[model samples]
Target: IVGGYTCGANTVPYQVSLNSGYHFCGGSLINSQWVVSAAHCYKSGIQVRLGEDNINVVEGNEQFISASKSIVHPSYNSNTLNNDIMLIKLKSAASLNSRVASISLPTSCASAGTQCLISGWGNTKSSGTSYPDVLKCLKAPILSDSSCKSAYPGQITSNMFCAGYLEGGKDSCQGDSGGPVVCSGKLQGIVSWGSGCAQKNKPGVYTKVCNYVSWIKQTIASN
Candidate 1:
């Protein structure tokens, strides 16, 4: 969380932690058994933690689950940073409760300029001073695809979009990858990449969730 405050404990039940022995990235529980994240966060021995607000210590509300397998997008380009989404299947289904829930995927194409909420345990500043013990959230506005292209040049593709403040001081950073970008109460994006933590005119980039709905459905169905 580049710039934000501690959110309510259960404010975002679907927000998950992708830990490869430790809290390395963020994710969203699409269901009791499925998690959507950034392919770039893919790693062996990844564990999923639901209903988790604090990363340093576990709360009674937390649900720990092991990942059986990870499904990275087939066309994911490592260099170009395209198709950065991935899915994880828990070894056993999660136990849903008021504190542990799932988020609904989008039903239509994304409209730019949408305001959204992003929560994570990433750094509070670009200097990488320290990570918050609890989850931090920030409100960011989506940028048009064209505006995004202007910022990243050739990096912005159809598979990606941008969201953040142009003036800086508010956005997601490292350790926040694969987190949910919730807009209008629906899962719309996943924290993917960005130039810096919160540099001027450098809005954070996200994997456009709507663009891969078909693939997400097919992968989950096949798996």
Candidate 2:
């Protein structure tokens, strides 16, 4: 797991693995038929695997569905990494069960200082390149805009926010992209990108979910 520790199965039942048969990225299950992920994770033939903890070994609750379609924000900037969010429409709806469920969206903005949880199978260390077979999670505190700006200079934008420790350690690393940042059990942000894994003063940057709530509602409703 990327800069985090291993977690028990089904701890984050709403989690999904966005796999391209070979490489994998993390995603959040917003509903039975839709998954919220990062736009940069998009690729041909990608599938969403839900209700799974260990990626390698077969699990009883696992549900793999091909991506019916994907929607990237029209204003998404790949070069600058702005609006780095996307949605995956599943070919078939997932079966909701104890080990597979959907997460609710945030009704209001998550205030600075609020602690959030992020889970994935990304690298466990800054210098690592491998992903864990099982899922992992870590806790990070949302930083104030001023604080975040100080750390990232002028790179922090309104569409993005920062979360993690200023002292280093405990963060979302590579392969954790598109994962959910749940605050008070509500989906608040999408793990987008950062300078480096667990670097001091370099908190992980996330696509602000609250800022894009209207877009999400409109897009999902229409699609």
Candidate 3:
């Protein structure tokens, strides 16, 4: 059994506030109005925060974007972690004016070994590391389909993807689940699951964004 993942960094890349408490995860500004995140993080009353800094702290100028609607993929299964993606219709589009930058979602990103980065306010050192009140960044290469497939035969379905160092030490942790896995200036995946915090041969598993393009569009349009 794989343990949940966590993230410890500046969640400015992507952060959220479920009612009042803050969350450390990654998200993408899919459009002027909608943002993407993992369904696991989507509770009925959830708010997403975004900015280009470390927005998880005691005091900071983090912007709050309320979710008018939280739409999780119709098939999301918390147990298997399938379809673990969701969209939040911000009561208003993130203020794309200054310090905050809206993220770009990919139209199409194929090919193995694609470079993608995952950021979150998760456990930084896999064991210790508090979520910072500022934003931080981390990068990892996308796993090849063949390699991703081999890592977890029954688990790494085509709809899913993987990343992180096989050597361990570097990865998203528990709190990092349900965040964006950005690549090449676009979002390719969202952090889903992994074995423990960080372990050798057990890279982070995420939902491949490409496979959910249709669902994303439909979910947003319908919402």
Candidate 4:
């Protein structure tokens, strides 16, 4: 299968792993050659193993890949989290067979109210404990600019994205900081920040994937 993927077919949506000891918040297996992740999630060592239904490294026939270079967005600043998207260059192209897969990139702007799926090995509740060797998935709603801005107040920038349950119990956490905010079957954002994970009135912000589409294509093309 060409342009296939492993993350969604099995596990809790966006979460993925590289080395056993190294943990990534969230990412998409674009192909055997490239990986889409948060620039802030950028780390030193990598050897990603994606799609283990519940964050089980040794469970469910794990899918693995070797990443040669980790490319962090040059403009990314952890302070304000500006330009927080990143791409990982695969050292070896992965064989797209069944069980192993790839994710699609967003081609257009997602409308507000579009239901997007979110997932990770993060906490189910804000200020809650993280899942033990397993990942969880949640359905989040994309807000209109008016709603997002109203929810985020002064922190919501146009370059970022926001989503979460308004009920205030479920949301992203410390580890889920850089996960994907997928919409319409394509990734729309990278989970960036919020007031306190799943806090009320505080939506989870992500690096807009559509905004960085050109950057990603160029990054991979140049590499």
Best by lDDT: 1
Q: What residue pairs clash in candidate 4, if any at all?
A: 4-101, 4-102, 5-101, 5-102, 6-101, 18-47, 18-48, 54-134
Model 1 lDDT, full chain set = 0.90
Candidate 3, residue 1: how far the Cα is off, in Å: 21
> Which residue segments of model 2 deviate by more than 4 Å?
none
Task: Estimate the TM-score of every prediction.
Answer: 0.97, 0.97, 0.84, 0.87
What are the lDDT figures for the candidates, one per model?
0.90, 0.88, 0.68, 0.69
Q: For residues 109-195, could you state the per-residue lDDT of candidate 4 as single tens digits?
A: 787888887766555545545443565567778767787788867766778877766656656676665666778778887777777
Off by over 4 Å in 3: 1-19, 56-61
**What is the C-alpha lDDT profile of model 2 across 1-223, one tens digit per residue?**
4567777998899999988875468999998899999998878888899888889999788898999889998899999889999988999989998789999998999999998999998888877576688999898889999999999897888989999988887788888899999999899999998988888888899999998889988888999
Whose TM-score is higher: candidate 1's or candidate 3's? 1
Relative to the true structure, candidate 3 reaches a TM of 0.84
Show where candidate 4 strays beyond 4 Å. Answer: 1-15
Candidate 1 residues lying further than 4 Å off, grouped into runs, are none
User: What's the distance in Å from true for residue 11, model 4?
Assistant: 5.0
Among all windows of ten consecutive residues in candidate 4, which has the lowest summed lDDT?
Answer: 1-10
